[PDB]
């Protein structure tokens, strides 16, 4: 569980329905209905963005989860580490020459089903979204996880037609 | 305690004498004789170094303390946050364009005397060193704090003649 995260995003048109579904499934809960704030960073010339990378500081309340994240360049590469002082992290990145190129808020819920993660998000105005994923270190099993992920997705009655390819930041820059 | 750091470093000729003295002063132990490893980062062209900044990833064992630190550009400025995954941070700074420009290890003990910090270090091949420090948000009390740090150090029979002006990195560079 690390550097390689396969993730499928879906549009969810029915919350309680989706909820009822997981409601009828054996699962662990990381947290429900927290507010997640994300701060995306980059240099003045947008160097990270030109290289297919994203740098993010993230805080989830009231769970109190705070992360320093870097995604890319590889399609499935994602690294992170928990941090205790979000403000210090923000201040250090600016001192490092970085600037917030985007900030965002959303209500989020994350559940566990085996080693797979289920994320349910709600963007005020655009609707509910769902993410299914698993982070692994072995990259050979990255096409087979992508499948059990689809399998799991199928359990919630979500078809490829429900698949959402536009990413959070990747879109609602709109 | 965060905006302004006041810290005086001194060379310690007699390690045992320093500790026997601390035994006569009311104090607390954070940790004793731990190994501290520091990894200094910068871009290949030394952007940060040339601007008086230090970007550091630090690990202390067996305490298990892991930090992401940025000191400077101002001499009295130091910011940090604990991180849970040292290797992820290392890999993220790498992905962000930084490289290890210098690394080091030393033996360190940290004690508390009021809101004052006393750090006793051992840098093999260079000798022992002590740091007396304090952090405050009140810029009006700087002179007074520096005075109390001299007196404190005076208790350990350390004078301005024992004052070490070089930073950790500079002492190593000899």
Alpha helix (H) ranges present in B23-167?
A: 86-95, 142-155
Residue A123, both tokens: 């963007």
Can you spell out the DSSP letters for chain A?
--SEEEEEEEEES-HHHHHHHHHTS--EEEEEEEEEEEEEEE-TT-HHHHTT-EEEEEEEETTTEEEEEEE-SSTTBEEEEEBS-HHHHHHHHHHTT-EEEEEEEEEEEEEEETTEEEEEEEETTTEEEEEEEEEES-SGGGTTHHHHHHHHHHHTT--GGGB--S-TTTSS--
Give domain A1-174's CATH number out of 2.40.320.10, 3.10.150.10, 3.40.228.10, 3.40.50.2000. 2.40.320.10
* Interchain pair A55, B89: CB under 8 A: no
How was this entry determined? X-ray
Looking at CA atoms only, how far is residue A109 from chain B in angstroms?
Answer: 22
* Interchain pair A89, B95: CB under 8 A: no
* Interchain pair B70, A3: CB under 8 A: no
In chain B, the residue whose alpha carbon lies closest to the alpha carbon of A2 is B88
Q: B124, B141 in Cβ contact below 8 A? A: no
Out of A2, A53, A95, whose CB is closest to B53?
Answer: A95
Out of A79, A86, A91, whose CB is closest to B92?
Answer: A79
Breaks (C-N over 2.5 A) in chain A follow: none
Looking at CA atoms only, how far is residue A73 from chain B in angstroms?
Answer: 9
User: Measured between alpha carbons, how far is B169 from B42 in angstroms, rounded to an integer?
Assistant: 13
Q: Give the number of other CB atoms < 10 A from CB of residue A12.
A: 19
Looking at CA atoms only, how far is residue B147 from chain A in angstroms?
Answer: 28
Looking at CA atoms only, how far is residue B138 from chain A in angstroms?
Answer: 18
In the DSSP assignment, the letter for residue B83 is B
**CA quadruple B43, B49, B53, B56: dihedral sign:** positive
Query: Domain spans of chain B?
Result: 1-174
Q: Which residues of A touch B82 (CB under 8 A)?
A: 83-85
Element (DSSP H or E) covering residue B29: strand B28-42
User: Measured between alpha carbons, how far is A41 from A21 in angstroms, rounded to an integer?
Assistant: 37
User: Measured between alpha carbons, how far is B148 from B139 in angstroms, rounded to an integer?
Assistant: 15
Alpha helix (H) ranges present in B85-161?
A: 86-95, 142-155
Q: A68, A83 in Cβ contact below 8 A? A: yes
Out of B73, B83, B96, whose CB is closest to A55?
Answer: B96
Q: B133, B112 in Cβ contact below 8 A? A: no
Q: A84, A91 in Cβ contact below 8 A? A: no
- Strand arrangement of the beta sheet that strand A65-71 belongs to: A4-12, A127-136, A116-123, A99-113, A28-42, A54-61, A65-71, A78-82
* Interchain pair A82, B84: CB under 8 A: yes
Size of interface A-B (CB pairs under 8 A): 65
Among B98, B96, B89, which residue's Cα sits nearest to residue B43?
B98
Q: Which residues of A touch B48 (CB under 8 A)?
A: 96
Q: Which single residue is written with the structure tokens 């992170």? A: A80
Residue A76, both tokens: 């499935």
* Interchain pair B79, A92: CB under 8 A: yes
* Interchain pair B92, A83: CB under 8 A: no
């Amino acid at each position: 569980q690390g550097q390689f995260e396969v993730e499928l995003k879906y549009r969810v048109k029915n919350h309680d329905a989706f909820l009822n579904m997981v409601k009828q499934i054996e699962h662990e809960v990381m947290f429900e209905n927290n507010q997640e704030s994300d701060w995306f960073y980059d240099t003045p010339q947008r160097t990270l963005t030109q290289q297919g990378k994203s740098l993010v500081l993230r805080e989830i309340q009231p769970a109190g989860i705070k992360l320093w994240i870097v995604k890319g360049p590889e399609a499935d590469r994602c690294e992170a580490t928990n941090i205790t002082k979000l403000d210090s992290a923000q201040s250090m990145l600016e001192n490092m020459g970085y600037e917030v190129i985007q900030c965002s808020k959303k209500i989020r819920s994350i559940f566990f089903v085996g080693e797979f993660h289920i994320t349910l998000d709600f963007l005020d105005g655009f609707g509910h979204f769902a993410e299914f994923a698993i982070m692994t270190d072995d990259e050979t099993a990255l096409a087979r996880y992508r499948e059990r992920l689809v399998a799991l997705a199928q359990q919630f009655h979500l078809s490829e037609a429900d698949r959402e390819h536009r990413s959070y930041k990747e879109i609602l820059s709109a």
